[PDB]
Amino acid sequence: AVPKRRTSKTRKNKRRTHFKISVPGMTECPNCGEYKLSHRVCKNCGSYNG
Template sequence: MAVPKRKMSRSNTRHRRSQWKAAVPTLVECNSCHEPKQQHIACPSCGTYNRRQVLEV
């Protein structure tokens, strides 16, 4: 198993971790109610997915 030869400094560790960012979820318009919703997920406001009613709202 690979083990680091030397301890990585706090500055280098934080510089490496600074690139870890949370991505903003992509929102699309619902086909039936035109509300913003996440892709590939049933619409939370009207309950449709792929132009079919899948949730009772």
């Protein structure tokens, strides 16, 4: 099926209310001192330290 009417700038900008990516949710490592992903290894130097 084809669209019957054009879509306005208003109705297009409401649809994308929810089209956004979220924060990666990271924490500082207690060696590197640099932000790392949770439950992963520090890329800068690898120390999981379970």
